[PDB]
Amino acid sequence: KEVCYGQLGCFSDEKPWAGTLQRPVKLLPWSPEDIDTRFLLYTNENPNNFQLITGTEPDTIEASNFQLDRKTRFIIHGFLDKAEDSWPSDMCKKMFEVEKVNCICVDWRHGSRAMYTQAVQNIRVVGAETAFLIQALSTQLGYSLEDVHVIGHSLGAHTAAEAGRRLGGRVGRITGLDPAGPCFQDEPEEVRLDPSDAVFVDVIHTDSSPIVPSLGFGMSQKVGHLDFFPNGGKEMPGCKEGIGGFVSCNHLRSFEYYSSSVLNPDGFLGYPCASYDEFQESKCFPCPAEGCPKMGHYADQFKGKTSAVEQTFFLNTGESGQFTSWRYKVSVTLSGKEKVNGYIRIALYGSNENSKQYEIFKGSLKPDASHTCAIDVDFNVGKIQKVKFLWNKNLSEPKLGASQITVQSGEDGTEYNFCSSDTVEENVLQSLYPC
Template sequence: MLIFWTITLFLLGAAKGKEICYEDLGCFSDNEPWAGTAIRPLKILPWSPEKIGTRFLLYTNENPNTFQTLLLSDPSTIEASNFQTNRKTRFIIHGFIDKADESWVTDMCQNMFKVEEVNCICVDWKKGSQTTYTQAANNVRVVGAQVAQMLKILSTDYSYSPSNVHLIGHSLGAHVAGEAGSRTPGLGRITGLDPVEASFEGTAEEVRLDPSDAAFVDVIHTDSAALIPFLGFGTNQLVGHLDFFPNGGENMPGCKKNALSQIVDLDGIWTGTRDFVACNHLRSYKYYLDSILNPDGFAAYPCASYKSFQSNKCFPCPDQGCPQMGHYADKFAGKTSEEQQKFFLNTGDASNFARWRYEVSITLSGRTATGRVKVALYGDKGNTHQYEVFSGIIKPGTTHTSEFDAQLDVGTIEKVKFLWNNNVVNPTLPKVGAAKITVQKGEEKIVYNFCSESTVREDVLLTLTPC
C-alpha cells in the first residue's frame, strides 16, 4: 500500500509540474508544451538570469570595434551609450556552445556598418548555452524574455518602436528570437539562421520560432537533413513567411560529410570540431554575412522542390520578383503570401558565396560531332567563366537550354563567346558553331539575342554579337 501511495503522489507531482518565477521576466513552468511531451520528454526548468549571465553588447558606427554594455538592471547605461533612436536596431543572438565575442557575431556588425548606420547589439548568453543541450534549449526561454525586457525598456523609456527592431538568431538563438517576438507586440523582423531542430521541430508555436513572432520572419535552412541518421542540426519545418533552402537546404558546397558526423551526441559534437562536423549548420550565418555586402547576389526562386529547381523548372522570377535571401529579404515583405513558401538558390562553396543565375539557349550550326558546348558571358560589369550548356551529339539546327550560377553580375550583356571540344582526335577536323544564343538573367524579363554565321574547330573561341 505504501508503494501504491508513493507512486500515486509521484504521478500527481509529475502531472502538476513545477514552476519558477523571476522578477520582471515572469514565470516558467515545466508543464506541456514545454516539457513532458514526445519531443520534449525531460522536465527541465530554465536557469536563473544570474546563472545564464546574459549580456547586451552594443556596437555602433561610432564604436565599431569596442562594445558598450547595456544593463537591464540599469537603463541609464543605454542613455550613456551611443544608442541612437533615429536608427534601426539589429540584435544578433548566438546559439548552442557559442558566444557573442565569436568573430562571426562581431563580423556581422562590421559588415552592417559598411552599408548602414545601425545600433548593432550582440546578445551574449554563453554561460547558458555552454551546458548540456537540453538545458540550453530550456534556457532559451529566459534569454528570450530578457531580450523582450530590453525591447520594453527601449519602448517605454525612449519611445523606441519595436517595429524598428530586427532580431537575427542562429541555431538556438533563432528560438530565443521567437520567444522575444512572442512577448513583443509589433516587432519588426526576425531572421532565423538555421533554427535548431532538436526539442523544437513539431512543437507548439509558443515553444519555437513561427511567423506570428514578428511582422516579417525570414529563415535560412542550411542543415535540414533529419537529425537521425543524417545529423542535420537545423529544422526542415517551415517556420517563417519566407523559408530559404540554399543548395537544397541539406548539403552545402564546401562542406564534406564525414564519419564523425554519424555521432549523435549533441553535447559532445560541437566542441573543437564545429567547422568540421557542423559546417552545414554554420553556413547560414556565413551566407547572411556575405548577403549584407551583396544586395542582389542571393536571389531565391519560388519552387516546389530543389529537384525542380535543378531541373530548370523555376526560371525566371515570377511577376512579383524574387526575394533576396539574407539581409535584404525584407524588401520582399509586402509580397509574401498567406501560404508559407519555399525558395531555392545556389551559392558558391566559399566566400564570396553570392551567385547570379542565367539561362542560356543555344541553336547549333555546322557539322554533326560529339562533344561539350560551353559559353561565357561578357557584359559592361565583367565576364563569366566558360559554363557547360550541353554535352552529347552536336547536331546542327538543334537547340539546347541550361541554367548556371555565375560568380558575378555581368550587367548589360554585350557579347557571348562560344566554345566546343571533345578531347578526341578527329581527323576530319569538324567545325561547329552557334547560329543563335539567347540569354536571360533570373531577376529580369530582358532576353538578349546573339547571332553568328561562322563555325569553328574544337577549342577555338567563337564570338557572337547582338542580332
C-alpha cells in the same frame, strides 16, 4: 515544477516545455546569473569594440552610442557559441559599411555551454532578458518595436522567437538562420519560431532534416512568412557521426549567406517554388514581374512579404567567398558540318568583367541540335554585351560553332540573343554578337 527569476517571471516544466517526446527529461532554465546574458552594443562610432548596455540601468543605454534615430538589430548566437569576436560581431561590421544601425549582440556563451536539452531551456531566460531590454528601449526611451530586428542562428533563432512572443508579435522582424530542429521541429508554436512571433519572419534553411533519420541540425518545417531553401535546403555546395552536427558546414552556411547579403543585396534572389526539382527543371523561372525577394538582409523589401505564411522560395548559391549567384537560362543552337563527341561551354560578357565558362551539354554534339540549360553565374555582368562559346573533345581536327545563343536573366526575365553561324576549332573561344 517551476522557478521564478524576478522581472523575467516564471518558467514551468509543463508540457510542451519539457516531458515531451523530444524533451523527455523534465528540465528548467538555469538562473540568469548563471546564463550570464549580455547585450553587446556596436555602432558605427564603436564598430570594433562593444559597449555593454543593460535594461535594468537605462542610464547605460543613454551614455552609450545608441541612437534613438537609427534602426536596431539584435543578433543571437546558438548552442556552444559566443558573440564577442565571432560571426555576430563581424556581421555587425559588415552592416556598418552599408547602413547606420544599433547592432546589439546577445551573448549568452555560458548558458549555451551545457547539455543540449539544458540549453533548450536556458534559451527561455535568454529570450526573456532580450524581451526586457526591448521593452526597456520602448518604455524608457520611446523606441518603437516595429523598428527592432532580431536575428538568430540555430537555438538563437528560437531565442529570437521567444523574445518575439514575449513582446506579443510587436517586434517588427525576426530572421531565423537555420533554426535548430532537435527539440523544436514539429513542436507547438509556443516553444519555437513561427510566423506569429514578429510582424515579419524570414527563415534561411541550410542544414535541414526530419527528426528521424537525423540528416542535419536544421528544420525541414517551414516557419516564416518567407522560407528560403538555398541549394534545396539540405546540402550546400562547398561542404565535402552526428556528434557535432550543429557546427557542420551546412548549418553555419546560413549566417554566411546572411552576412554576405548585407554586402551583396541581390546576391541571393529567391524564386517562388513548390520543390527544388521544379526549380532545377526551371519550371520556376524567371522572377515574378513584381520582383523576387532578396534572401538575406534585404528580405524586408519584398512586396507582399507578409501577405501569406510559409511562402516557399528556392535558389542556388556559390561555393566560396561571397557565395553570390545569379540564375541564367541559356540556349545554344549548334553550327557545324559534321557531328562530333565532346562538351559545350559558354561565357557571359558585359563591359563589367566576364564570367567563367559554364558547361551546357556533354556527349553527342551535332550540327543543328540545340541544348538548353539553367546556370548559376557567380557575379553580375549586367547587360550581356557578348557571349563566347567553346567546345572540346584527341584529334583529327574538326570545326564546331554556335549559330545562335539566347541567354535569359532570371533577375528580370530579359532575353538576349547572339549571332554567328560560323564554326571554330577545338578550345578556340568563339564569339557571338548582339542581334
